[PDB]
Amino acid sequence: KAAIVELLKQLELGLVPYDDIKQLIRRELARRLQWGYKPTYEEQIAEIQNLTHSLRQMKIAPIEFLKIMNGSNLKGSCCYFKEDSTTLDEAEIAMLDLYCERAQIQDGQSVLDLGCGQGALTLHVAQKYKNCRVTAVTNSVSQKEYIEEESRRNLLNVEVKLADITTHEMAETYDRILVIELFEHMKNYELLLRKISEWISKDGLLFLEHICHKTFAYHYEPLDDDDWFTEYVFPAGTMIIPSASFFLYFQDDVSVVNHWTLSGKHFSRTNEEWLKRLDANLDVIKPMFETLMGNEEEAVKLINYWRGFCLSGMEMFGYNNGEEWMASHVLFK
Amino acid sequence: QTKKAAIVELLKQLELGLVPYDDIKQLIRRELARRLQWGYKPTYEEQIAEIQNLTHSLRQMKIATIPIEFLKIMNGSNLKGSCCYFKEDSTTLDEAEIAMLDLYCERAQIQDGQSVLDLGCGQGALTLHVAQKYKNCRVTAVTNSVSQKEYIEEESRRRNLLNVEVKLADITTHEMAETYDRILVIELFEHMKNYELLLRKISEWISKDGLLFLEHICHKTFAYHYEPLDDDDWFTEYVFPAGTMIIPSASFFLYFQDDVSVVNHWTLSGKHFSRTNEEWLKRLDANLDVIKPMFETLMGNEEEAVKLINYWRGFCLSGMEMFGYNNGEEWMASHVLFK
Numbered sequence: 001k002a003a004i005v006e007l008l009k010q011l012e013l014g015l016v017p018y019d020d021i022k023q024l025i026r027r028e029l030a031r032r033l034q035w036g037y038k039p040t041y042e043e044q045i046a047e048i049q050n051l052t053h054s055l056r057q058m059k060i061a062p063i064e065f066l067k068i069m070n071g072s073n074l075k076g077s078c079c080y081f082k083e084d085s086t087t088l089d090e091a092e093i094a095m096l097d098l099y100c101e102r103a104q105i106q107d108g109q110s111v112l113d114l115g116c117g118q119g120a121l122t123l124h125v126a127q128k129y130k131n132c133r134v135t136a137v138t139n140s141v142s143q144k145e146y147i148e149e150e151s152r153r154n155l156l157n158v159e160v161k162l163a164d165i166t167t168h169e170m171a172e173t174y175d176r177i178l179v180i181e182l183f184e185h186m187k188n189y190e191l192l193l194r195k196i197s198e199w200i201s202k203d204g205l206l207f208l209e210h211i212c213h214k215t216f217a218y219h220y221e222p223l224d225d226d227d228w229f230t231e232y233v234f235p236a237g238t239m240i241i242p243s244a245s246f247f248l249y250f251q252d253d254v255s256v257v258n259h260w261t262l263s264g265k266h267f268s269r270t271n272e273e274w275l276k277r278l279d280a281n282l283d284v285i286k287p288m289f290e291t292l293m294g295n296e297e298e299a300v301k302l303i304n305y306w307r308g309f310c311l312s313g314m315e316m317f318g319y320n321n322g323e324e325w326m327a328s329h330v331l332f333k
Numbered sequence: 334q335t336k337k338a339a340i341v342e343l344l345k346q347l348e349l350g351l352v353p354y355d356d357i358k359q360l361i362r363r364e365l366a367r368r369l370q371w372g373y374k375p376t377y378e379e380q381i382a383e384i385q386n387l388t389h390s391l392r393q394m395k396i397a398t399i400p401i402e403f404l405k406i407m408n409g410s411n412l413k414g415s416c417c418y419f420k421e422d423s424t425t426l427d428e429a430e431i432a433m434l435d436l437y438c439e440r441a442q443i444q445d446g447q448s449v450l451d452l453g454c455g456q457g458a459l460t461l462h463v464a465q466k467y468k469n470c471r472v473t474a475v476t477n478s479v480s481q482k483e484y485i486e487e488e489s490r491r492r493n494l495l496n497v498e499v500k501l502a503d504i505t506t507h508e509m510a511e512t513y514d515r516i517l518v519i520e521l522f523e524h525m526k527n528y529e530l531l532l533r534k535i536s537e538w539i540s541k542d543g544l545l546f547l548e549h550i551c552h553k554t555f556a557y558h559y560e561p562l563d564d565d566d567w568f569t570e571y572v573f574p575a576g577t578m579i580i581p582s583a584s585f586f587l588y589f590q591d592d593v594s595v596v597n598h599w600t601l602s603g604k605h606f607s608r609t610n611e612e613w614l615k616r617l618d619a620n621l622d623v624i625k626p627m628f629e630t631l632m633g634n635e636e637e638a639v640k641l642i643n644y645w646r647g648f649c650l651s652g653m654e655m656f657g658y659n660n661g662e663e664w665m666a667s668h669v670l671f672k
């Protein structure tokens with residue numbers, strides 16, 4: 001631990017060259033892989049069954065910064081880079097268009113954005129389809145505030161609900177429900193999918209994007225006492241990392257209609273772009289953090305928090321040419 | 334067209350039993366290797382996408398497109414004409430049958446008073462076994478063959494198993510107003526096409542809290558119509574005519590959960606089916622005294638009886654090599670329990 005604590009202190013202060021940080025991240029990822037893979041497909045399949053059965057015993061459960069690091073859509077999730085020259089702003093729009101296509105959004109439908117973030121998707125379909133009725137759901141006051149203000153822009157077809165989702169109930173029915181990278185923060189997917197399914201009209205569809213590993217699934221919990229990486233961005237226990245196949249195991253109340261995966265290079269590049277915008281803008285970010293926080297030290301730590309955020313995303317999803325950790329798209333009916 | 338003539342001669346020689354086993358095996362491995370190169374994709378996105386093409390394509394199709402004295406020689410005492418389960422290097426075919434049958438009963442969670450449907454029952458090994466272990470179960474076997482029906486009913490009577498019933502039906506067109514607490518499908522789906530139509534039909538036969546247990550052969554990762562990769566592929570049609578079978582992926586029926594919902598998934602190493610076929614080949618070879626004359630008096634003459642020998646040798650060697658390939662970690666069996 002003390003070696004871990006010393007590295008962590010060095011990272012907080014920004015004293016480690018990026019090349020060294022990536023090298024150390026890869027060491028941990030290599031170990032995750034050896035831990036994740038099994039010598040036998042029987043074991044590999046059994047491990048998924050262990051995780052899904054125990055999940056079934058559980059319960060479900062600053063804007064000037066974002067405008068700098070994110071593209072102009074404020075999409076705080078995976079973007080889509082066809083072509084080497086694709087920019088972040090193009091990659092946001094492409095990913096957003098991809099959701100519309102795969103989730104089969106059509107002009108006069110009621111659309112639900114479950115876990116809307118901030119809220120690139122709801123604003124995107126609301127503007128593209130003036131006869132859609134779009135509902136965004138979030139448990140953040142700040143986010144609800146922003147999407148409401150941004151909805152003008154003269155958008156009359158946007159509604160935001162401030163709710164927990166874990167505990168939330170409602171009478172309403174939607175033709176299309178979109179969940180982009182929400183489930184990683186949930187646990188009992190059986191109960192979650194059951195709630196959401198009551199919100200889907202009979203001929204409606206649920207579209208889900210989640211991060212994953214192509215073969216194994218796990219609690220994002222540190223591997224052992226010197227896995228400094230698993231808790232470098234998130235506190236342990238807050239996230240799960242599904243396999244590409246994971247939600248094929250949760251079809252009690254919905255039924256899989258299509259399944260795609262996208263290479264980890266996309267999310268890797270996404271983070272890369274975020275990091276470039278961060279490092280190219282410390283001139284305004286540092287004072288901003290200094291004001292928001294109390295002092296210089298805490299502002300310097302916050303900066304390197306965001307660095308580690310991006311670097312984690314870069315190396316993890318870019319590992320082995322994006323052919324280990326990736327994105328999965330699932331359409332249910 | 335040199336390649337092609339070479340192939341007609343190889344088949345000529347294999348048909349007359351002129352090629353040594355080790356050479357046959359080597360030749361089979363070369364075809365298996367090309368299958369793997371064809372089935373595996375450079376990116377997982379393409380791999381996943383290849384599955385979808387197949388499952389979406391099957392939904393566009395229709396539901397679908399041997400002397401017992403021979404079976405008693407080559408199979409074990411249960412006449413299980415499907416995968417058996419070998420723990421221990423010393424395990425015999427008869428034991429591997431039992432062990433496998435008991436595994437079905439456990440993973441299918443059979444309880445003693447339930448109604449049980451054995452869909453596509455072959456020679457009745459599972460129906461006879463269930464009816465014997467669980468005396469209060471009503472067991473119903475289904476088959477489209479009058480021979481198999483006769484044999485199973487006669488074994489019921491003989492073994493004193495009154496809780497057996499055999500229905501003569503084509504599962505493709507079959508309809509009934511019955512409902513069963515548990516339904517067992519052992520290696521029938523490889524002969525069907527539209528799994529959405531088939532599983533909807535079967536799901537109607539499950540009672541409310543009932544379960545469906547399925548065993549199927551598969552590849553770990555990819556799925557395919559059992560058809561020749563290309564004109565050099567003599568192996569894919571070496572045993573079955575083309576278009577008669579489908580090799581699913583381990584995960585394949587996970588994509589057909591419109592009407593049933595997966596509760597559990599397991600897989601078994603390919604070594605088990607590989608040893609199954611090996612025991613079958615051993616028995617075929619140690620009993621030619623009986624089998625050759627039996628084939629002769631059932632075929633045109635002596636030559637036809639020989640090519641029939643070698644056709645079965647091909648059946649077992651295909652099974653051996655395919656499922657034992659890469660230590661049983663490519664082609665294998667999948668068990669799926671649905672509710």
Ligand SMILES: Nc1ncnc2c1ncn2[C@@H]1O[C@H](CSCC[C@H](N)C(=O)O)[C@@H](O)[C@H]1O
Nearest residue numbers: 075076077115116117138139163164165180
């Ligand atoms: N329990 C909960 N109830 C409602 N919303 C939640 C939630 N937990 C997380 N969220 C929302 O889900 C988001 C996960 S990040 C995904 C945001 C969005 N799909 C985008 O990428 O642009 C959080 O930012 C928050 O807005």
Ligand SMILES: Nc1ncnc2c1ncn2[C@@H]1O[C@H](CSCC[C@H](N)C(=O)O)[C@@H](O)[C@H]1O
Nearest residue numbers: 413414415453454455476477502503504519
């Ligand atoms: N269309 C159909 N209708 C009813 N039964 C069929 C069928 N097509 C195949 N079958 C049955 O399905 C079997 C496939 S082999 C599986 C048999 C058995 N489960 C065992 O392991 O021994 C055939 O033996 C035949 O009895």
